[model samples]
Every structure is written in structure tokens, then in C-alpha cells.
Target chain A: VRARVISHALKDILAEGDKVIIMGHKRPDLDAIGAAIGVSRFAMMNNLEAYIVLNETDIDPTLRRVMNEIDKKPELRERFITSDDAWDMMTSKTTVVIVDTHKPELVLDENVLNKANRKVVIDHHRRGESFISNPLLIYMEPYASSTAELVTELLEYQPTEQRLTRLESTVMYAGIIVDTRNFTLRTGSRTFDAASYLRAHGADTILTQHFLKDDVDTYINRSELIRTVKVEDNGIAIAHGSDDKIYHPVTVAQAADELLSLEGIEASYVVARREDNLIGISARSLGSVNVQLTMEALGGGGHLTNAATQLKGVTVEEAIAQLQQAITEQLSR
Target chain B: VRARVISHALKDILAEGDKVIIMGHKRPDLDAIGAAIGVSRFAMMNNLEAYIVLNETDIDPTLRRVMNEIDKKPELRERFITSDDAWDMMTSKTTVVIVDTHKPELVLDENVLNKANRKVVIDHHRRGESFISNPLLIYMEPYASSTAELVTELLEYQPTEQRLTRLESTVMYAGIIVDTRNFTLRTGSRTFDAASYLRAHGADTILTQHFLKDDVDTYINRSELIRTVKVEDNGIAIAHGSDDKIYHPVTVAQAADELLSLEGIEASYVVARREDNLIGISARSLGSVNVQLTMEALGGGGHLTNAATQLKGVTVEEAIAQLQQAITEQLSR
Candidate 1:
């Protein structure tokens, strides 16, 4: 973990210039958000211009507080850069920090992903074949608990406490909490240590609890969604939550991921509808079935344990059928 | 909680006893084992000859350590007490204190249960119709975190420190850890406070970790069991480990319980073959379908969230089909 963080790949990009754009995955969860915020903080502390660009409208309420505090100006919505900015920022000196994602296709903005110069990728998801071939710096660890965990490690090596703030702490903490399911399912000692560190730095639990509180509708939807889980052969479970309206894909994924922890389940899938009529799908496995590869077949990608994709025209049932078939094929092998 | 414990109904029965027999639920989890130890310690401290009579073949390793220190012997065998001895122990003055369970049918010994003069029930499961009627005393609280949590509360009101031995503390701590899934699910502030109190009295984390490691065959069996989960309707998932002769009914029940916690599953069932040619079934539900009632239909019973039953002279498939039919019928209603 230390070797990757202290590698020259990340250092080379930081040394390039001050203006930086930190980007995350599409339909982001805490891992993506935490990594983005942590990098933004690290850059800001070093006297650099840093901006965190979020692609989706449905951000997790738990992450909103920390992300909101860092850039609280109501008018700063204009500060959000689009793909056009990515095209313009493609200069020899402008550093683009792509955090918490591996594949270029999975990026929120394809134009930004393609145009970014001096690209640096830091992710905890398993590496895919289609990942950007030659980023200036790349740090990826698939087994590190969460991307926030990786970002926390990066913070230790970076030469800046100036960028570190209470808000940053909260952001990273939320990221950790979200990925690890409040440390109930996928967690280790370091994850708790990270939480303990944040707690010590005054990450307010009461406020954080409020951040985690979902609306009644979200709870009802989740409860109903959980009722549809279908456990499969080879220890896999599948469920679909896609409907005509927007929904929380990560929430569905988290619930599916948790289902995989059941005694007779080793993998799980959650498919929910996103904005723009495109279905958002998440696949989680307990190191079986290679969910990243399974998701890639559907134009989405993730790690060995978890991944996501978006589908057009295909109904949720069709998507699930395809996923189940793909997983069956994988199991047969 | 403290007030409830101080004014609990069992104070007189606890006060008068010299020789006492204490037990917990069948195929005991941490809460079952922990509460038994806690009560045993409390009884001994009060100068009573307390025995924790478990019908189980073995207990969780972490719990066994605490039991070994405080209990004269902790391992349980099927015929630990012959029918004659069980009958002999039943004197008019003999007190039978059953912790964490209330159903007489679930008790290990009919002779022992029938012979005992006074019946005391301490449990945390949802109330069932078959609960021992007209008990001399009863302490039941379904809202509490674990049976350990309930017993710990009871100890606070008892007027002596003899019940506060380090051995008992360690066992009770292990119980809390297991029932709460290491404090991940279904936990409250009081649970943590109890753990903290136990830690202060000397519970060791290393020893606890050691006890949690299962045998190789158990691990392999768990993997194999998970490979067979099946989906039921839009709201349930089912799995069975009875395909092989190696697994136990308890293992099947545990798998079913955990499977029910998956993303879209509101109910789950697992059944395993026992050496006696009886097909044992376990049911789990996420507060949707009433699983305890399903078990009752099979002439067995448990709590709503988790339940179990047995079918003599039946194949696993037949038992599963009947159980699934029962669940489907109930859900349709």
C-alpha cells in the first residue's frame, strides 16, 4: 500500500502545475466522492486550484454534507466544469486526477476523459483491459477495502496539511462508511482505523448520522427492492430495481452486495433505473464470477468483487436475464 | 433498561435458589450461550449451585473459554443426562431457569422440563403462542439487542460483585459479539456500553478472534451450501445444504437466516439432513412473511426472523417443496 502511494507516478503529476481537475466515476458512491474530495483537499492544501466535478444529480445524502461544506458557495455551481472544460484544459501542464475509477468508458464525461493531458488514475477497483493505457501516474489496489481508504493513504504521503480540513475528513469518512456498509460487511482493521482517525479529528457522528438518514421513500423503495432478491447457483444472488424514474443505484448495489454475505450466496446483482431512461446496473461478487468482466459485457465495468453498467432500450428483466446468463457462462468455465 | 432489570419478576426465584439449572436456546448462537453464562455467574455469585445445561454438541469457541472458567464443564453431548437423571433432578423445590428461549417444545429434555418444580423464562425473541404458560417468573424483552444485553442489564440490579467475574464478563462479551455480528447489525448504544463494561472487566480480543475460526470441513461445507441458493417469487430466496450428509440442520438454518438478509430477499429457507434420518429445516424472514408460523405448521417453531422445524421420514426435496408452498400461500394472503 505504501509503495504504490509513494510511487513516482503520482509525484510527477503533482509537480507539473497548480490548476487541477479531480474527476470521479459516473453515478458515484462514497468511494468516488471520497477520493475526489481527498484529492481536491490535497491539491488545495498545496496551494493549487482544485475542483471536484460530479456527473450525477442523485448524490448520496450521507456524502452531501462533507462535499457541500468544502465548496459551500451557492453560486459555485458554475464552478462545475463540463466536457468542454476537459477539452480546453488539455494542456501540457494541466493535471487531471482521475480518482476511484479505472476504465475510460466508465468516466462521467467521455470528452474530458479523452482530452485530459497528464492524466493520473487512482482507483481501488480491479484493473480492466480497456483502462487508459498510459496515464502519467496510476495507483490501483483492488483489495484495499474502499477508494477512500486508498485516498487516506495518499493523504499521508502528500506534502500538504494545508488542503486537509474537517470537511475533507468527513468526506473521506463518508466514503469509507458507504463502501464498507458502515463496516458491517466488507471491512478490515485499517477501515476502522481510518474511521477512528476521522472521529478523533471531530467528524461529528450526530451530523454524519443525519447524512446517512434516507427519506421515507428511499427506505420504502429499498425495502421493496430487497424483496426481489433471487439467489442462484454458484452462490450468486440477483435482484432488479429498475423502474421508469430515477433511483439510487448505489443504494441498490449496497443492498445487493450485502445479500451476497448471506450464508448460501457468494455473489449478487442490483439493477436500478437511472435518469435519461438508461438503466443503471451494479454487480457484486465475493471474489467469484469476476463481476467486473460480467459487467463489461453489458458496457459497464467494476472490480472482481463489484462493478456497474448502463443499458439502453433493454428492459430490467432483459438486463437481468443477460447478466444471469453471462454469470452462468462464467460459472460453467 | 436498568429500571426494568431491577424490578424484574425473577428476583424472588433468584434470591431463594441454592442449586439452579440454567439453559438457553437450541443450537445456540452467541446470545444464547452468553446469556446462559451471565445468568450462571450471577447465580453462583449469589451462592447458588448453577449449571448451564446445553443440549448442543459444542459451543462457539470464544464462548467455550468463558464457560470453561466459570462452568464445571461446558461441552454438551446428546445424552449428557440420561432420561433417569433428568427425571431424578426434577424435585418440587428444583428451579429450572431457561434463558433466551420460552417454548417448552424447544427445550432439550421433556423429562427435565416436566420434572422441574418451578419454571423461569428469560428470553428476547418475539413472543410465541407456545411460550411456557404460567411460569413462576419471566423476563422477556424483544427490543433489546441480544440476550447478553438483557442479562447484563439484570446483573446491574443484583446487589453483589460475585456475579461480576472476569470469566463471565469475557463470555458475555463473546455472546454480544456473535449475536450482533461483531456489532455490525441490529446494535444500539446500550450494547456497546455493555461491551465496554465487559472489556473493563477483562475480555480479550485475541482469544475471541481465535474462537471464531471454524474447522476446515465446516468452512468447505459453508461454501458448498452457499452454492445452492434458489430464488422464490419476487420476495424470497431459498437454499439447502441437505443435498449432502455432512452438514447439520443448524448450519442450514444459519445459511437461511443470512440469505434472507440479501438485497431483495424478504424470506429464505434452508434444510439439511440429520443423522437420524430426519430432515431439518430452518426459515428466515425480513419482517415480511411470518416464518415462525411456517415452522409451526411443520410441528417445529422459532422466532419470526429465524425459525426451524423437522420432518421425519421425508426427503429434503419434499420438505423444501412443502415449506415453499407454505411460504407462497402465506405471502399471497
Candidate 2:
């Protein structure tokens, strides 16, 4: 209800600017990229030039598939730009819309974010220690399923003359699916209401499935990743990564989600060396454990079930030892 | 809409019988048992004595958790009976309400099913070559997500005097989740409508989660089973069970579902040895392949994406060989 109320105000902010540059988080997953796409479409519908700041290189295979799809659509492919391009074009007259992350430190390029003449923040994560201090507009609803959902709602009140592209709607819908774990967690009726809106505008699940399926191509990464899965009646399950092998963040992220879907598991932890060489653990919980607290024990913060942390100088085995030590120290169960 | 019309006719059918015997399929799932519970409650609300025939022993751990919850409920625990007890009590005046499965041979106890003079068939599966030929009332809508959903709709039209118990609603809701794979497949607007109705009746998702989590206990079975996951791209993926190891049908069933969730996999087949010594292959598809035809090649029948087959006296390796050979012949891509 409030989303509809704020739509025109956001449009007014966009209208005042000559062009819009949309920025997402450092590691742009679909939720980040998807929500960024929605904001870009929101700008496009208002007849403003829009660019989404992203680096297509180092994108995991799943995103490569999505980018390849984006490439085929001539109108959509031209909008994506790297941080350097974003810095070159950004002017005080430029409107910078940051999405999927509220924290200033988390943005793709802090220089691009700080350089903008005007800044707007739209995100779904609960606020932490830092945020965009001087902002033109901030539309953050932690209750919303995803930033894609919030943007989709804003798109709802836009002019009907120009509409969303098929690729645009599909990406937005997939963001909601990935974050909600197929709508199994922390979902509300508005999530489906926004989904229904996207569906009528040519959001296709098959197309969405193809893109998200890239997360699972880690079956080689996944089955092997979970090869050491052992459940401790502490209502927790633990799995590990190879000391020498680094796994995609999304791969380990999903590994925890699927394992926690099994009965008797309250929380599941996957400790793996990430692309950056930091040992990262994706901790997934099913209500019993406030998995955030466990990750919080390691100085990480995120949602309740979907939480994570990174250790800079730890081996994968040491990551597990610290994880188990933290679980004993922190978890309620 | 149609359920309301059939409600009165079915209530009329129930009024004519001296008692009601609710039955589910051979291996009763939450969907099967949950719908049976809904029907028994319908009978209860009508002031008729009803019994749901089920075996408590050797039941899978998931259903065992559900049964433990039911055991504490004074009003519901007494409703379940063994096949022997059902056979002993069934009479020409008894009405047999069969749920989840429409196949006559698939009913929990064929002797008890055949003994009853009146039988009511209610299911969501697409009909095959066999059915309850002499069913007095058949409620089969292949479009419905599950029989639990169908029963929930009928519950909607009944007298509001005696509303559903919290346990009753949760079980019914879980049935829908299990069958629909978290409402990601073969779902329509009414599915959510029915889910909303169940939610309003005090369906506790926490209790439901406990029971269904038994499914994830198969993670040990899952990651290991998919350890052999090989995508043939005959638009397909194949995984195998240990020739010496027998797996729960649900384990193999889920392996097929999760493997197909990966990108580039249009279909997935999990070949596993079962307790019955039949080498059962669960085939899951994603529209590119008519996985049903692959299953049909080996004489199994089911819905489009979810289809399966079992072979006699075949090794797991032999199962895969025949599976690949048949897929080459049966699939389109």
C-alpha cells in the first residue's frame, strides 16, 4: 500500500535528473542485478536515459547465461556499463539509484556512489551500521521480499505507454524466487501480488529457470561440496569445500538451502574457499536456529536463515573448526 | 466453484452410508494421508463415525513425526486403523473414501476397498488406464495441485459449526507443498486460494515444517545420490544408486527433481534399487522432453514433468543403459 503512495515521489526525483545510473552490490547476484534492472526499467519508462553499472566479466556461469540472453535483445544489451564507464558519465546532474544494498561500503564502486550529484537508495535488507548519508530519496522496505519486488511495485504506477521488456520482467521475478528460496521463507501476499503483476507482463518461469539453473550446475561442486555432510543432533548439518578448490558463492549459498530442506536439520553450514580466497560459509537455517547469530559470532550479518561470513586467513578446515566452535558458543539450540 | 456443487451431493452420499472409511495409497504420503484426514473431518462434522485406514509401523520418519503429533490429539488419534481393522469393520453400508490415488490396485488394502459396497474416488492425478471402475462419486481434477487441495475446497463449503483443527489444517497444507514442490510447478491461482483458506484455519507452518523436514534427512541420500549426476543432454541428467544399496523412493524422487532444477538439464532420471528389488527410475522433465514418454517406454505412467518406471530383475547399471537407450529413441532433443 505504501509502495503505491511513494511511486510518484520517486518518479519526481528521477524526473529532476538528466540521466540515471543504477548501482548494485559488489558481488552482483541476480537479486542485485535483477533489482538494478527493475530500477533501470523504471527510469526507461519515465523517458530518461538509464545505465546499470555492472562488470559482466568474473560473472558466474549462471549470470553468463543471463547476460548472453541480455545480449540478444538489442535494446536491453546497450544499457550495462562497467564502473569506469559509470565514473566517466556521472555528473552532478546525474541521478544515482543504488539497489539491493543499503550500506555504502557494499556498493560496486564507492567512488561512483560518492561522486554522484544526487543519490537514491532502494533495498530490502534490514539496515546495518552504515547507509547513504545524503540521499535525494531513500525507499527501503525491509518487509518487501526483494528490491526487485519494491521496484516492480514502483513500475506498477508508471505510465502505461511504454512497458517492461520480457527479459526485464523475468529477471525481476527470478530475484524474488532466489531470495525467497522459491517463496518458502519470509514471504508475504504482496510478494505474490507483485509476481502476478510481472507474470501478466510476460515474465516467463522457463526463461527464469534457465538462468537460475546455473546455480545448480554446481552439482559437481554441490554433490562434492556436500560429500562430507554430517548432521549433529544440535539441529545442525555441516559440509565442507576442498582446501585447494574455490567454489562460487551462489553454489555454496544454494548448497546450504537445499540441505536445510531435509528434516531434522535446523541449520546447515557450507564452508568453502570463495573466488577471492577468503574462506566463506553460507549458513541456512529453518526457524530453530537464528543462523544470523551464528554468522554474527563470526562478525557477519544478514537475514535470519540466509546468513553468511568470511574469514581472511583461515584454511577451509580451520573455517569448519571455528564454525563448530561458534555454533557451540552462539546458537540457541 | 464445482467443489461447492459436489459438496452437497457428496454430503448426501455420506448421509446414506452408515459409516465412512477413509483410505490412501499403498505408501501413504502426507498428501495422501492429509487428504484422508480432511475427508474424515468432513465425516466428523456431519456427525458420522469415520476411520482412516493406515499402518503406523515401519512408516518413514517424516510421516512418523506427523503421526506423533496426531497421537497427542485425542480427537484425531482414534481415527486411524490398520487394514485388518478396516477389513473387520467394513460392511456393505460402509462408504470407502479413497484419496490421492485413483487406481483401484494402488489403494492401501484392495481387499478392504473391494469389500466396501460404496466407494468415493477423490484425487488430483491425471487418469491412467486403470481406475476405480465402480466408484459411486469420483472427484478428479488433474489441474488441482493435490487431493489435499481438492479436499480443502470441499471443507470450504461445509457447515462452519465445527471448524478444522490446527493439526488438520497444517497437514493438509503440507500435503500441497510436498506435491507441488513448494508451489513451483503445475500451480494455479486456486492453489494459493486454497492455501490461504488453510492458513486462516490455524495451519501452523512450524508444525508442518517439522514433518516435511524429514524429506531433507535424505540429504545424505541426496548429495551422495547426485554424486554420480551426469547430464547426458539428450536434454537429460542421469544419477545412480549403489547396486547393493536400496534407497527410499522419496530419495530417488527428489534426486530427479533437484538434478532437473540445474540449468541446461531439461530432464533428469535417478535409477535406484528399491526394497522391493525393482530397479525404479524416477524421471523428471522441464518441458523440453516428455519425460513421461521415457517412463512410458518402460510402462510407467504419471504427469508430464513427474514420471517414473520400475524394472524387474535389472541391475542399476542395466537400468541406466536401458534408460539411455530409450531416451535416445523417445526424446525430441
Candidate 3:
């Protein structure tokens, strides 16, 4: 029933607006990008102009490949705009849709949120204390695998005349795959239902596979992180990066995921220096331990299986010690 | 429905027999072992005795670990028997169920098929010309991701009074993971349905991860093969192992998969000497190349994305040359 109401509202909002701006969290992952693209396509189907706001510096190798593929289409290329452009284009009638994240501070351009008269929030992450309020629409399903899954569900309630292109379906499917780690975690029957729907509409599995291929540097960085792993009591694996080496946030998360695949490891933590003054910790679990609770203790929060936190003025070693203590404390409880 | 008819036939067969013997192909993989164990549990649920026959020497280190886990349960351990014991235990009233492989020649104990008056074949492999004829029942779905998936579907149709233990569900879930490459290939709606069912019934994703862990030697072997990769005109990667270095068949297949993960690689082939006179080749693709057809040309067969073959009295280099030619020919068509 909520979906029906949202669908009706979306149609009404699109009818009143000449354009829709879709934005995701900072350092956007596949779920964010895929959801942005999916909603952009939906706006196009409704005969409304849509643009995806992305920070140029935030494009990693994986997202770069996906963006390159999208660049092949002139129409899609036109829909992509930098955060600066998004700020300039915002108008009172422009509808804003924030996807994959709901934090006001995390939006690509916070001014766009303030400038736009109508704002919408579609996110799958668990709600935090710092969330966007008084939106024109908000659809947050923490139980959903990814924002792409939520977008797909919303698309089902929209006008049937607006059909998704093969590329649009493929990207949304890729979003679900990445967020669920290829359906190994946080996946439910509805996730498969969404995947099946995408497959029937010509989601190219091979192309999605290509989009996920990693570069050699990522492999090297991951192996380096894995070499530092120390398995703690209660089956938690902990590792830290070299102080001199600055790693991509995604690579750190990937290393943590790889460590979880080791035998007898129930959860994994990777602490690294994202920059000179900031330390990052990525926590992943097999659902035996609630990493979200653990990360929340360190001023961060996410789903039960995946969570991360960033620390200011802390060393990588300090981050690791803090994470280890948190894991021990969480497990005892 | 086909499922209902098969379920009814299975019920009738169980009623007529006091005991059933479960068997899989020689050198059984996870799908084979998991399906056999799953059916054994199903038989016990219906108040009938069940046994799983195996060639003791063919168990790999990975499977040995899974077997050790199963051995902790006396009820399950008692049902495991060697081929010789399977021959001695066979009785006129015993029913036989062959899983994972349909060809009569591939069973662990071929004599068991000849001796049993009632035979059932449950396999996900494409139908072979040498399949069992006049069997009491046959459930073959080549499109299925794995035989464990097919078995899971069958279990849903059975009496729900008996539920699978955590270990039992874990192994079945592991089977689907191994066959689907962690849900990156051959996956469909039914595959995720089976996985969701297993997870709901106490399947531990962390435990399943333990079953798929690779040893240090295996990882080293995969990296060595990756270093030898040569890209073909169509972005196919081809590699050959040293004659002095004999690697596990699973490791060889894993190497091929790793090569396929490289950016721009469409498919990968790894050739190695398995024995003094036998050379093995593992082929993997991301669906752009028909690996099954390429392998079939060399006397092996599998799905569109994964396949393998062995050559008698051939060196690894010779096998690589032959595989390269086969891939070239297949691509031209």
C-alpha cells in the first residue's frame, strides 16, 4: 500500500517537474550508482529529464568501468553531471531523489537538497539518528538487499508503459549482486524475484560480470592486506594496513570480505589509513556476529552483516585495537 | 506437474524398499556428495535406511574435511560405505538412487546399478546417450545450477515433519555455491529459492565458507598459472602448467577461474599434467565463449561457462596447443 502511494506521488511530482536530480552517498558504490541509473531511466520513461550527480574524484576502477559502459550511450552520457553542475541546475520545481543513502551530510550536493522544493529518499541502509527529515517522499526498507532492489520494487508499482532498457536492467541486477556479495548474504526471496524480473527483461549477466572485474592493483592491495590478518578469539579475523600506504576504501572492504572466507573465521575487520589524519575500519560478518552493533559503538552504523567507521586523528594500529576491543565486547554480550 | 509426479513415484519406491543405496559419479564433487547426503537424510525421514557409496581413494583434501565434519555424527557416518562394502550390502529389496551423474559408467559402483531391481536417476547434467534406461524414476534438469538445487526442490515436496540439521543444510548450501561459483554463473530464480530454503533451515554461511577454503599450496599453484596466461585475439586467456609441478584438479579449475577475473579477459583455459600419461585441461568462460563446445571437441563436456577434459599420453604443452586450436575454431564459428 505504501508502494502504491509512493508510485502515485512520484507520477504527480514528475508531472509537475521538468527534471529530476538523482544523487547517492559520497564515494558511491555499485548499489548507489545502479540505483541512480535505474531511477534516471525511470524518469526518462515518464518523459521527464533526469541527471545523476557524481563527484569526479570519487570514481574508482570498478565504478569507472561501469561509467565507461554507460558513456557508450549519448543519451545516458548527457544524464551524468558533476556535483557542481547539479548545484547550478537545481530549481524550485526540480524533484530530487536521493538513493542508497539518506544522511543529509552524505548527499553529493547538500545545497541541492535545500534548493529543491520536492525531495525524496530511497535507501536500504538501516536508519541512523542523522537522517533526512520532512521529505516529500521516503521509502526506506532496511530488509531489502540494496537500494537497487528497492528501486526495482518501486518500478514494479509504476506505470507499466515505462519499460526498462536491457542496460538499465543489467545495472540494477549488478547492484543487487554487489550489495549481496553475489547473493551469499542478506538475500531474501524478494531479491531473487527482482533478479528474475531483471533477467526476463534482458539483464546481461556476462556484461555485469565484466563490470565487476578487478584491476591488478586491487588484487595486489588486497593480498597485502590479507597477509597482515590475525585471527582473534571468537573467530574474528583482524588486519591492518601499512601507515605509509593509502588504500581505496572499497579495497579495504574487499580485503575484509576475503578474510571472512577463511576457514573458522566468523567475522573480519580491516583497519587502514584513508589519509594522513583519517583512519578507516571495515567490518564484515557471516551473520554470526552483528557487525552493525560493533561499528555503531565506534560512531558508525550499517546492516547486520556489513558496517564501517572512520576515525579522525587515529592511527591504523589504534583503529585495529579499537575494533578488536569492540568485537570482543560485542561477542561477550 | 513434473515435480508432483516425481515426488509420488519416490514415495512409492520408498514404501517398497527397506533400504536404499545412494551413489554419485567417480571422484565426486560437492554437488555429488551434497545431493547424496541430502537424499540419504530424506530416506531416513521416510523411515527407510540409506547408504552412500564412495571410492575411498578418490576423496580430495577439501572433501576429506567435509567428510570429517560428517563423521562427527554417528548416524551419518554409519551410512557411509566403501564400494566393496556397498557391493556386500546390496540386497534384492534395496533401491538405488544415482545423483549428479546420469551415465551408468560414471557411478562409484557400476555393479550396484546392474544389481538393483529399482533404480532412480537424479541429475542436473545434460542428458547423455549412455544414461540409465528403464529406470524407476528420472529427474534431470540440465538448466539447474546444481544437483543439490534439484534435491532441495524435491525435499520441499516431501513430508515436512523431518527437518535438515545445520550441518546437512550447510553442505547442501555449499554444493550450490561451488557449482554456481558463488552465484556468478548458472543461477536462476529456483537456485536462490533453494538457497533461501537452506538458510531458513539453519544453513551456516560461515561453515559453508570453511568447506570452500583453499590451502596455501592451492593458492600458490593458482598464482603460478595466472603468471603464464597468454591472451588470444578475442581476449581468451590460455595458460600451461609445468610438467614437474602436479596440481590438484580443483586448483587447476580455480586457476582458470582466476584468469577469467582479469580485466578484458573473455575466457580462460589452464592445462596441467595430472599424471605421467594424462594431461588435464580446465576451461572457464563468462558466457561469451562456448567452453562446453570447445571441451566437447576434446572429449569432455560441461555447461556453456565451465568445462574440462583430459588427454591420454599428452604433455601439458601439447594439451595447451590442442585447446588453443579448439578455442580458435569455436570462436570462428
Candidate 4:
């Protein structure tokens, strides 16, 4: 019932607007893109023109595949525009919608969010203290598994005949999958409700897997890094890739995650030589250690459970030494 | 509606018996064991005595952790009975329930099943041509994620206030998690419905992870096995661990499944010396190759997607060669 009310409100905001400019977070993930597309679909349902501002500047293989699929469909492909085009084409009454992220700084184009007369924020994350303010219509449910789940409910409430396409639902379903780590965490009944509805509307789990598929090389690299793990009696696990092998940051991060599965592990760190010619350390905590503190001290940052840092002009041995020192110092804090 | 109907029927059957015996497939995985635990709870709901048949002869570390947790609970530990003990306790007044599998031979104690006054079968597999005959009640829903999911539904429909234990529900949730490969396959609305129900009823995802999580040594062994992998031009990949190192079957199995994600891999095999001094081969396919047939040719049989075999007193090299021969023969067939 709440979704239906919000759906009506969203329609009104779009109805009053001259156009809709949809944006997601910088370096947007599948959830962001999927929700943005959902907003775009909502705009078309209301007989309003919409543009998705997709810079594609930091695209990964998975996002690239999704973008490629979108490009094949002319109707959808034609809707993607640059920030400059969006700024040029906007009218005084143009509505700006930010999906997935509520923070102004995270949005792909803050210029568009700031300039628009009507702004809407659709997000699932717990909003930061400083968030986009005075939005005409805001649906920010921190309880929802993903923004895509929120978007799906909104799509379901449409009174109009404009329906969800199979591919549209498929990608949205994947957004939820990736964000929730295949529903292993933060999933509520509504998440399943959204997923079930999407499956009924033709979400392809196989295609979702295809988009998220990793290269064999990445897996091998991650596995190899995990082989070097040394576990301390205090339940700290540290792993490092071979010094000569330049590993991707993603691979090293995965190795850190893999270490958390160890029986006595409270915290884990994976060190690896990176493609950037710097040594990187990815840290993870199993709710016992503050990895972010150590990462911050090492000049990198993330959250308590996961964090990372890079060292310049240092050998892998030197980086390891620094990591040990950082861990020792972090205990005092 | 189906759940309610089955629930009432099960309660009626429970009233006819003074004791209930729960059984699962041989060398049971988490799904089989988890669903068996669920059935134990169902019997207790009707105020009937229940025992779980656990033949730990083939137990893996994941199941070992679960059993260890059960050991921590005195009342639960008293409920675990071996197949031999199960055979001695069978009587006309005893009701036997088979879970996670329908095939008669796969049950831990077919003798007990054959001798029981009443038999109930709860499975999520497609009914095989060979199945338990003339059961008192059978619930086979291939569409459900796992037997754990189905059993959770029955629990929902129960009239009694007797509830699931935290450890009990955690293991059951782990069952569904394992079978669905984390809700990626064979999951529907009912799956999520059951999962959410369990979550609200104190399903501990953290403890479930503790039971299912891997150790660093296992990771390194799996990685070492993968490092030697060689893929064929025909998309068949094979790897082997060294002859002397004793590898766990789970490690080799995981190594093969990892190869299944390779883009071009039709079939994958990992050969290694298992803890039992047998060189085991784990084979997997990505829906293209009939790995079951290949493994059957190598003296093991399994589903088309996954299969395994073991050879007594053989080196990894010998096992690898035999696996290669079986693969070439399977291709011709």
C-alpha cells in the first residue's frame, strides 16, 4: 500500500516535469543501473521523455556486457546521454531522479541533481547525515535489500499498460542478486517478493550468472593468493600473492574474504603486487577486528568489515612489515 | 494449501505412532541432514518421541561441525541414533520418514524403512523411476529449493505451539542454502517464504556459515590442485594433486566445481589422494557434457552436472590417466 502511494506520487512528480534525467552513483553497480532503468521505464509509462546519464567511464566486464545488451535495443540505447547533453536539454521543470545512492556527491552528475527544479531520491542504503535535501518525492528504505527491489515494487504498482520487458526484469533481478550476495544477507520477505515477481516476469537466472561470471584467470589468481595464508594464534590471517605476480585488486580482495572462512580467523589481510606497480593490502574482519582502522592507518579506507590500502615504492616484504605494524597499532585504538 | 493438507496428514500419522524415526540419503549432505532435523522437530510438535539416524562414517567437516553443535545440546545429542541402533528400534508402532531423497537404496537404513508401520517421504528431487513404494504420505516438490524448504512449509502449517530450536533451524536453513547454491537455482516464492519464516524463528546465518565455512588449509589444497589444471581443446579440463598429500574429497570436489565456471569448459575433473588413501576424481560439467556418464565409466555415477569416483591404492597420475581414458570413451558413446 505504501509502494502504491509512492507510485502515485512519483507519477505526479513526473507529470509536472518537462523531462526526467535519471542518474545513479559514480562507478554505478548493477543495482544503480537497474533502478535507473526502472525510473526510465516509469517515465515512458507516464508519456514523458527520459534520459539515463551513463558516463561508462569506470565500466567493468559485467557492466560492459549489460550496457552492450542495452545498446542492442534501439529504444533503450537512444535514451543514454552524456551529462553535458542532459544539462543542455534540461528545462526549468525537468525532474532529476537519483537511484541507488542518496548522497549528492555519489550521484553520477551532481550538477544535474543540483540544477533540476524537481528532485527524487530512490535508495535502499541508510542515508548519510548529509543527504540530498528537499526532494519532491523520496523513497529511501534502508530495510530493503537493494534499490532494484524498491524499484520492482514501484514498477508493480503502475496502473498503466506499459509493462516490464523480460530483459529489464532480468537485469533488475541481477541487481538484487549481486547486492544481497545471492540473498545470503540482508534479505527480507519483500526482497523475495520482488525476486519472485521478477522471475514471473521472465528474469533469467542463467543470464544473470553469465553477466556476473568471472574469468578463470581471476579465480586462479585468487586461489593462488590464498595459498600463502599464515594464521596467527590470535585468529589473524595474512595472505600474500607471489611478489613477481601482479594481481588485480579485486583478486586480492577476494583472497581476504576467503580467509574469513578459517576456523579461528577474526581478521584477515591479503597483500599483493598490483597492476598499478604498487603493493596493495585488502583487509577483512569477522565482526571482531576493525579492519577499516588499520586500512586508514595504512592510508586507505573502507568500513569495519572490509577495507584496503596501497603502498607506493615499496617491496612486498616492506608492505607486509608495514601491515604488521598497522595491525599492532590498531589494537590500541 | 498443499502444505496445510500435508501438515494435517503428518499430524494424524504422528498420533498413530509412539516413536518417529527420521532418515536421509547415504553420505548425506547438508540438505539431507537439515531436512532430517526438520522432520525430528515435526515429530516433537505432535508430542511424539523422535530420533535422527546419523551414520557419520562418511561425514565431512561441514557436517562434522553441525554434529558438533548438536553435541553441545544434551537433549539433541540424545536424539542421534546410528543406523544399527535405528534397526533395533524399528517396530510396527514406529513411523519412518525419509527426507531429501525418494530413492529407497539411498536411505541410511532401508531395513528400518521396510519394517516400519508407516512411511513418509519428503523430497525435492524429481521422482526417479526407482522410488520408495506405497508410502503413507509423500511430498515431492522438485520446484522447491530443497527438502528443507518443504519441511519449513509443513512446520508453518502445524497447529501445535512446539517450535524449532535455533541450531535446528540454522542447520535446516543451511540445507536450503546448500541445495539452492545460495538461492541461485530451483528457488521460488515458497523458498523465500520459508527462508524468511526461518529467519524470524531464529535461523542463525552466522552459525550456519560457521558450519559451512572452509579452512585456509582446504583453500590452499584446492588452489594447489587448480594450479596444475590443463584444459583440452575440446573444452575438457583436468587437474591433479601430488601423489603423497592427503586431500579431502570436499577440496577436490570444490576444485572441479570452480573449473565449471570457466567460459569454455564443457567438463572438469580434479584427481587427488583422499584421506582414505584412495585417489578420488571429482568431475563437473556446465550443462554441455554428461559428466555423470563419464564418471560412471570411471566407476562412479552422479548427476549430469556433478560426479565422482575413487580408486584404491592408486597414485594421482594413475587416477588422472584413468579419468582421461573414461572421458575419451564417454565422448565416443
Each prediction's number of clashing residue pairs: 11, 6, 0, 0
Deviation (Å) of A258 in candidate 4: 2.0
Model 3 alpha-carbon drift over 4 Å, by segment:
A1-20, A40-51, A54-59, A73-94, A157-162, A220-333, B12-21, B40-60, B71-94, B158-165, B228-250, B269-284, B287-333
lDDT of candidate 2 over B77-128, digit per residue (tens) = 8888888999999789999999999888998889998898999999998889
For residues A198-251, write the lDDT of model 4, one tens digit per residue: 877778787788778766787787887877788888777888977787988788
On a 0 to 1 DockQ scale, where is model 2?
0.31
Candidates in descending DockQ order: 4, 3, 2, 1
Question: Which consecutive 10 residues in model 4 chain B have the weakest lDDT in total?
Answer: B212-221
- Poorest 10 consecutive residues of model 2 chain B by lDDT? B209-218
Candidate 4: pairs in clash: none
Cα TM-score per model:
0.43, 0.72, 0.75, 0.83
Residue A136 error for model 1, in Å? 3.0
Report the C-alpha displacement of residue B73, candidate 4, in angstroms. 3.3
What are the chain A TM-scores of the candidates, in order? 0.64, 0.75, 0.73, 0.82
lDDT of 3 at A165: 77
lDDT by residue for model 1 (B94-198), tens = 677787788988765555777777888878779878887668877777766687877787776666656466655766777777776775555554665566566
Q: What is the TM-score of chain B in candidate 1?
A: 0.61
Report residue A244 deviation for candidate 4 (angstroms): 5.8
The Cα local distance difference test for each model comes to 0.66, 0.83, 0.83, 0.84
Residue pairs clashing, model 2: A213-B263, A262-B216, A263-B213, A263-B214, A263-B216, A263-B217
Error of 1 at A78 (Å): 11
Ranking 1 against 4 by TM-score, winner: 4
Better candidate by lDDT, 1 or 2: 2
How well is each residue in B138-162 modelled by candidate 4, as lDDT tens digits?
Answer: 9989888999999998998765587
Which candidate's lDDT is highest?
4
Alpha-carbon deviation at A58 in model 1, angstroms: 8.8
